[PDB]
Amino acid sequence: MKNIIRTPETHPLTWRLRDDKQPVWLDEYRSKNGYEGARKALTGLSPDEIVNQVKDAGLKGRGGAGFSTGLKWSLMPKDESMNIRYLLCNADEMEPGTYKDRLLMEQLPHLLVEGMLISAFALKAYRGYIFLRGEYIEAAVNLRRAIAEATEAGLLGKNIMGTGFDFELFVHTGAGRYICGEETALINSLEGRRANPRSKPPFPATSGAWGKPTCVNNVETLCNVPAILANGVEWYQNISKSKDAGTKLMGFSGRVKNPGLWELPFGTTAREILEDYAGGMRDGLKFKAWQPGGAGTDFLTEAHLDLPMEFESIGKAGSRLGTALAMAVDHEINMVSLVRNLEEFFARESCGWCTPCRDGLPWSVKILRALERGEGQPGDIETLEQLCRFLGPGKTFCAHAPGAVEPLQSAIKYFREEFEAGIKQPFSNTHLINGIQPNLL
Amino acid sequence: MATIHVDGKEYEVNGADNLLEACLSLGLDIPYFCWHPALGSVGACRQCAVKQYQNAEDTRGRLVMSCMTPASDGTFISIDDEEAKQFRESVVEWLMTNHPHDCPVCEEGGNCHLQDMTVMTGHSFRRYRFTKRTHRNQDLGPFISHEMNRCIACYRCVRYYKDYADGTDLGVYGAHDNVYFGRPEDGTLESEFSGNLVEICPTGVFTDKTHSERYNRKWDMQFAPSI
Amino acid sequence: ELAGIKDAAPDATFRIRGQKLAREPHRYSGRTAMRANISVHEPRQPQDIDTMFTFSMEGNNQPTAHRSQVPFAWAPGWNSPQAWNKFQDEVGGKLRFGDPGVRLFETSENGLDYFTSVPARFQPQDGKWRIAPYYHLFGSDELSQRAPVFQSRMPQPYIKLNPADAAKLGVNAGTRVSFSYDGNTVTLPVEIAEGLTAGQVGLPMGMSGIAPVLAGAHLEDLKEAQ
Amino acid sequence: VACNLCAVACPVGCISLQKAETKDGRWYPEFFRINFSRCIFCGLCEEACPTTAIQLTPDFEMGEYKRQDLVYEKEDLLISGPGKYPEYNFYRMAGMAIDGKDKGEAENEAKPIDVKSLLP
Amino acid sequence: AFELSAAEREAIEHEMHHYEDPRAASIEALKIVQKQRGWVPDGAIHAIADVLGIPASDVEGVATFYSQIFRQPVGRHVIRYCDSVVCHINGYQGIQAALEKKLNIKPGQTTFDGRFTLLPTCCLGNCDKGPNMMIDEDTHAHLTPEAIPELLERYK
Ligand SMILES: Cc1cc2nc3c(=O)[nH]c(=O)nc-3n(C[C@H](O)[C@H](O)[C@H](O)COP(=O)(O)O)c2cc1C
Ligand code: SF4
Ligand code: SF4
Ligand code: SF4
Numbered sequence A: 001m002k003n004i005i006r007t008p009e010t011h012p013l014t015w016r017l018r019d020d021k022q023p024v025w026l027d028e029y030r031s032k033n034g035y036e037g038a039r040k041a042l043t044g045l046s047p048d049e050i051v052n053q054v055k056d057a058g059l060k061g062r063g064g065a066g067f068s069t070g071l072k073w074s075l076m077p078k079d080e081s082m083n084i085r086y087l088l089c090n091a092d093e094m095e096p097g098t099y100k101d102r103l104l105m106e107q108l109p110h111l112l113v114e115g116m117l118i119s120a121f122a123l124k125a126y127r128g129y130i131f132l133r134g135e136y137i138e139a140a141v142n143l144r145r146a147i148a149e150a151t152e153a154g155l156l157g158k159n160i161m162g163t164g165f166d167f168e169l170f171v172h173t174g175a176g177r178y179i180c181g182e183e184t185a186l187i188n189s190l191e192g193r194r195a196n197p198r199s200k201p202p203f204p205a206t207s208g209a210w211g212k213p214t215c216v217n218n219v220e221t222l223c224n225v226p227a228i229l230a231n232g233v234e235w236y237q238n239i240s241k242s243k244d245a246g247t248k249l250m251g252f253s254g255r256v257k258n259p260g261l262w263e264l265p266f267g268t269t270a271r272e273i274l275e276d277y278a279g280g281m282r283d284g285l286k287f288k289a290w291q292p293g294g295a296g297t298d299f300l301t302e303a304h305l306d307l308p309m310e311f312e313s314i315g316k317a318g319s320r321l322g323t324a325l326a327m328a329v330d331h332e333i334n335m336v337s338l339v340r341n342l343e344e345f346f347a348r349e350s351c352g353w354c355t356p357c358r359d360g361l362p363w364s365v366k367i368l369r370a371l372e373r374g375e376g377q378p379g380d381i382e383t384l385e386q387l388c389r390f391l392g393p394g395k396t397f398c399a400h401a402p403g404a405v406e407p408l409q410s411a412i413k414y415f416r417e418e419f420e421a422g423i424k425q426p427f428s429n430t431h432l433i434n435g436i437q438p439n440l441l
Numbered sequence B: 001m002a003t004i005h006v007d008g009k010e011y012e013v014n015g016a017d018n019l020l021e022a023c024l025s026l027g028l029d030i031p032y033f034c035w036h037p038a039l040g041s042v043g044a045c046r047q048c049a050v051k052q053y054q055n056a057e058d059t060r061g062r063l064v065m066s067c068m069t070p071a072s073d074g075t076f077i078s079i080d081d082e083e084a085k086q087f088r089e090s091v092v093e094w095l096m097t098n099h100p101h102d103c104p105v106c107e108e109g110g111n112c113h114l115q116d117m118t119v120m121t122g123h124s125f126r127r128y129r130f131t132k133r134t135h136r137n138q139d140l141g142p143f144i145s146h147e148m149n150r151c152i153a154c155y156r157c158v159r160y161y162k163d164y165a166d167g168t169d170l171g172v173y174g175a176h177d178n179v180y181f182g183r184p185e186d187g188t189l190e191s192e193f194s195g196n197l198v199e200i201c202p203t204g205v206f207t208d209k210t211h212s213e214r215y216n217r218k219w220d221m222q223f224a225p226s227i
Numbered sequence C: 001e002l003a004g005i006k007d008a009a010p011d012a013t014f015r016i017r018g019q020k021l022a023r024e025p026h027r028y029s030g031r032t033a034m035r036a037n038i039s040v041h042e043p044r045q046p047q048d049i050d051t052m053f054t055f056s057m058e059g060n061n062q063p064t065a066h067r068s069q070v071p072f073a074w075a076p077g078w079n080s081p082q083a084w085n086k087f088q089d090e091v092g093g094k095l096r097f098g099d100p101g102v103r104l105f106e107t108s109e110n111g112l113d114y115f116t117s118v119p120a121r122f123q124p125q126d127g128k129w130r131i132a133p134y135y136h137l138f139g140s141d142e143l144s145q146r147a148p149v150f151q152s153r154m155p156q157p158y159i160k161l162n163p164a165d166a167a168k169l170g171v172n173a174g175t176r177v178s179f180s181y182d183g184n185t186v187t188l189p190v191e192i193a194e195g196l197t198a199g200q201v202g203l204p205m206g207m208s209g210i211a212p213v214l215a216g217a218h219l220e221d222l223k224e225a226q
Numbered sequence D: 001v002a003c004n005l006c007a008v009a010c011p012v013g014c015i016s017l018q019k020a021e022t023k024d025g026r027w028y029p030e031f032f033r034i035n036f037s038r039c040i041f042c043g044l045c046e047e048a049c050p051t052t053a054i055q056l057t058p059d060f061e062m063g064e065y066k067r068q069d070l071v072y073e074k075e076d077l078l079i080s081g082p083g084k085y086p087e088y089n090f091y092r093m094a095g096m097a098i099d100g101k102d103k104g105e106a107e108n109e110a111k112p113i114d115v116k117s118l119l120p
Numbered sequence E: 001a002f003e004l005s006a007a008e009r010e011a012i013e014h015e016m017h018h019y020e021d022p023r024a025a026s027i028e029a030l031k032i033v034q035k036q037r038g039w040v041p042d043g044a045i046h047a048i049a050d051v052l053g054i055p056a057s058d059v060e061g062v063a064t065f066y067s068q069i070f071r072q073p074v075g076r077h078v079i080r081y082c083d084s085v086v087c088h089i090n091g092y093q094g095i096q097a098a099l100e101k102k103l104n105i106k107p108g109q110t111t112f113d114g115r116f117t118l119l120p121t122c123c124l125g126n127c128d129k130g131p132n133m134m135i136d137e138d139t140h141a142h143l144t145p146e147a148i149p150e151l152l153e154r155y156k
C-alpha cells in the first residue's frame, strides 16, 4: 500500500532508491554501505569459500528457471591450467511483462557492478560482459558512466584493492532478438553468430564462450550476492520462513489501479499483491484470469489466488513461477485475441532452428486467427490440442516452445467455451473437380 | 562393446556411436533428415524421435532423438512405440504444410529422401487448409539450379558447405519460418565441391542443371560401376 | 608387377548364387517402346561376355548379396542416396563384404638413399622467362574441357605477371602481350599477380594452346601486342 | 508435363517419352510414343496420371495393314480440347513459376516475403 | 560505389579490442554503420566482411537474423510501437489506428514524404506504464490517440 517502511533489513536491494527516481552514483553509493562487501571479499575471502557460502545461502536464479546458483557455480572445472574464464550477465529482458531489471540497471548500476565483481572473484573470471538489450539506452549510458566512475576508485582495472585479481568489465548492447535471452543462444550472440541455442551437454560451465568455462546469470542473481556478503548468510536464510530464501522483485501489471513492481519476500500470496500493493482492478471491471510470471506462463483463475509465490507451490498448481511479474486479464478482453497475440509473438520470435517450433507455431496462430474471425472449422480444437501435446519439454531443441504453448493449453483447458464458440463452419479444404467423384468419408 | 535393448530384443553395438547409426547398422528403419554420417548430428529436424525408458521395468519414458543420444550399454529404446510414431508422423506433417505441389515437375521425383520418409512414416492425409509460404530463387551457376520452395530447413547444406568443405559463399538468412538458404547475391558457387549438394540436400532445392537438360527418372536409368 | 589386377574384380563366370549382376533397376520401364520408331519388333538384349553384369534388369542387386561391385543403391523404402546405408556393415564405414580394388605393391622392407642433387637458388635472367604453371579444375584435363557446360565455366586465357615485371615492361591489366614459344607466336591478355615472384610468367596449363609440357620451359621473347 | 509416371505404371511398357523444357520453364514432352500393338487398354496409365493429360475415350476404331504404323506419335494423340475433365489445370496448383504465374500465384499460396523485409 | 568511412573503421577497430575473435564485434560493427546511415546498404556487408576477416555470408546472416539491423531503406524516423500482450490489454489498437490514419501508411510501409516509417515491435520493457512507443531514441509512455498529432508535431 502507498506508505511502506522500506528498511535495509527487509529491502536489501531496493532501499537505496531516492524519491526523485534519479540514479545513485559511487560517492552516494559508498556512503550508504556501498562496496564493503567487495572489500571483505577481495581482502578476506577465498573464491572457494565464497562459492560455498553462496551455495549454503540457497540463492536461486531469477531468470525464470530457479536453479541453485551455488551448485551451478560449483559445476565449473577444478583445473588451474584453464585460466581463461568468462562471466556473462543476462540482461536481455525481452519477454513481455518483464520490466524488473530496467529499474536495477537504470537506478542502481553499482549494485550490478559490485555483484559481478564478487561473482567474478568467486568464479576467477578475468573478463565480464553485461549482455544488455539494445533498446534500453539510458540503462546503457548510466551503466557505462558508472563503470567509468568505478575505474578511478580502484575497483576495476589492474591491482584492484591491492590484490592480484584482475577483472575488466564491458557493456555490449544487443540487436533485438528474444532468443538471445536463452543462455546458450546468448553465448552464440556474444560470439557474433546467429543466436541459435546449443545442445546440452556439454554445459557452458565447461565449454562456453569461445570454448572457455562460462557462467550466464540473470541481473538480479548477480545483484543479490552483495547483500549476502555485506550482511551475512545467517541473515539471508532467515528473511522468510519459507523454502525459498531471500527477496524477489514481484509486481503486478495490467489495467489495475496501481500497476507496478515492489521487492517482496517469497511466499507472498496474490491477494495482498493485487489488492493491497496494486490496489485491485479498476472500478467497474471484474477479474477473469492472471498469468503469474509473464507471457510464457500458464493462465490462472480466481481460485488460484491466495496461493504462495514459490517455484514448487506454483509448480504443483499447474503453472510456472517464471519472473514472478503477474498479469491481470479482465472480463472485457476476449481470450481468443489474447492467445492469438501471444502465439503471434512466440511464432514470430522463433529462431527457426527446429521443425516443431518453426512450423507448429505458425499453424497454431493461423488456427487462432480463424477462430477469432469466426471461420473456425470443427477439426481446429483437436489440432490445437495435438500441437500442445507434441510441443512439450524435450521434444523441441530449447525451452521457447513449451513456454509458447503453456498459455495456449491452459487457456483451452479452462476457457474452452470461447474457443469453441467460433466454430460456425464445417470442414472443407478441397474443391470439387468435375468428372471425378470424391471419396465420401 | 555395448548391449542395447530395442523393442524387447537385444543387440550388440559400438558404445562410441549414437543411437541412430547404431539402429541403422542393425537394419532398423528410423527416419531422419538432418543427420549425415560424414557431417554428424546436430538435432535440428527432430524427425528421428524414439521412446527411451530408464530400465526394463519403466513403462513410460521420454521421447529422445537417436542421433543426439549415445548408444551406451544398458539403453532401453522403442522405435515402434505409438507415441514416437505419432510424433514422427506429426513432424512429417509439419514439414508438409509448406511444401509445393511440384513432384511431377521436380527433378528429385523418384530420388527424393522426403518422399521416402513421408511414405515410411505413413502420412497421406492433409489437414492444413491455409496459405503456403513461398520464396524466390537465386542463380547459383551453370551447374546447380535452385528452387527454395522445396526446402525443409534441414541445415545439411550449410553444415556441409561451411564446416566440412570450408566454402564461404553459402549461408542461412532470415528467421522463424522465413529461413533462406543460398548466396548473398546471385553468382556461381565458387567451391570446387559444390555439386555434392545435389546428394546432400534431401529435397529438390539444389538440383543438377546438367541433368535437367536431358532429364529422366531414376527407374529409367541404366547404371554400371565405373571409375 | 601387374599380378594384382585379377583381384580387382571377379571374372565373367561370377554369379550371385546363380544370378547375373543387374545393371537396370527392377522397375525399369518402356522396354517395348524405346525402339518402336525404328522397328516395331523387339531386338534381343545384348549378351555380355566381358563382365558378370547383364544388360538387363533380370539379375541381382540385393544389399546383402555377397559382392563388392555394387552398380547402384536401392532398397525398399529408400530410393535416395541414403539407401547406401543398407549396403554397408556399419553406416559410414566400409562396404559390407569389402571395397573393390587391391593395392598392387606393399611397403618395401628397405628404403632409398638421400638424393645429393641440391638445386641452386632461382635467379631471373634477361630475355629468358620461367613459365610458372597455373592449374584450373575446369581447364587442365583433356576430355572434360570438351564438355559444353564448361565453356562458360572456364575463365578467359590469361598471362600472369608480377607488378614489377609489368612496370618494367610498361603494361597493365588487360593489355594483350605477345610472346614466342618454339618459334610460334601467341598473344593473350595480361593479368597482374602480386604473389607471383619476379622473373616468372604464369600460364594456365592444359588450355587450348598452352600445353602442360610447358612447365619449366622458357619464353625467349615477350613484347607488347599491336 | 512429361512426368514419366504413365510409362513406369504401365505393366507392359508401351509408353516411351522424353521431357522437354521451354525457355518459359513449362515441362512438355519432346516426344511421346505409344505402341498400340502391345497395348491392352488396362487403363492404369489414365489413373496413374496426376495431370489428367492421358485419357481413354470411347473409340475402338483401329485397324492397320502394317504393325509399324500402329506406333502412335504425339501428333496422333494430342487432341484439340480437354476431354473428360474440362476445367482442371495442373500448373495453377503447382508451385513452379511459368508465364502468367509468378511466385505466389498458385492456389492456397501466400506472397513471397523477402528476408530483408523490415517487419520482424 | 560504397566505401566505409575512416571513422566507422576507427570505431570498429576500437570495439574489436574487447574480444578474442573479431567475429564477436560483427553485430556491433553493423550497428555503427546503421548509426551513420539509418540502414545497412548492400555494399556494407562486403565492407564489414573484409575488415573483420569473416565471410560476407556470415555478416548477411547476422544482419538478416536480427530485427533491428535494417537491410531495406528506412525513413527519417523509425516509429516503433509495442504490440505485445500488456499493450494488447492496455489498448494499443487505438494507437495503431490513430498513427496509421494520420500517416495513412499501413504498418511496414514508408510515407510519401519519408519522414516516418511505421513499424510494430516487441515488448519495450515499459509495460507497467501503459501503451508505449519509441521514436528514434525517445520513449513515450501513457499513450492516448488524442496525443498522437501533437507528438508528431515534436518531430516535424
Ligand atoms: C526462450 C528463452 C528466453 C529466455 N530469456 C531470458 C531472459 O531474457 N533473461 C533471463 O535472465 N533469462 C532468460 N532465459 C533463461 C536462461 O536461459 C537461463 O536459464 C538464465 O539466464 C539463468 O540465469 P539465472 O540463474 O540467474 O536465472 C530464457 C530462456 C529461454 C528458453
Ligand atoms: S524450439 Fe523454436 S525457438 Fe527453440 S531453438 Fe528450435 S526453432 Fe528456435
Ligand atoms: S523435392 Fe521431393 S518432396 Fe518436393 S516436390 Fe520434388 S519429389 Fe516431391
Ligand atoms: S536447401 Fe536442402 S540442405 Fe539446405 S536446408 Fe533446405 S532441404 Fe536442407
Ligand code: SF4
Binding pocket: D001, D002, D003, D004, D005, D006, D007, D017, D048, D049, D050, D051, D052, D053, D054
Ligand atoms: S502428364 Fe500423364 S501422360 Fe504426361 S508424363 Fe505425366 S503421367 Fe505420363
Ligand code: SF4
Binding pocket: D009, D010, D011, D012, D013, D014, D015, D034, D038, D039, D040, D041, D042, D043, D044, D045, D046
Ligand atoms: S492402357 Fe495401354 S499404355 Fe496404358 S497401361 Fe495399359 S497397356 Fe500400358
Ligand code: FES
Binding pocket: B020, B031, B032, B033, B034, B035, B041, B042, B043, B044, B045, B046, B047, B048, B065, B066, B067, B068
Ligand atoms: S536426424 Fe536426428 S534429430 Fe534430426
Ligand code: FES
Binding pocket: A096, A097, E082, E083, E084, E085, E086, E087, E088, E122, E123, E124, E125, E126, E127, E131, E132
Ligand atoms: S508489453 Fe507493451 S510495451 Fe512492453
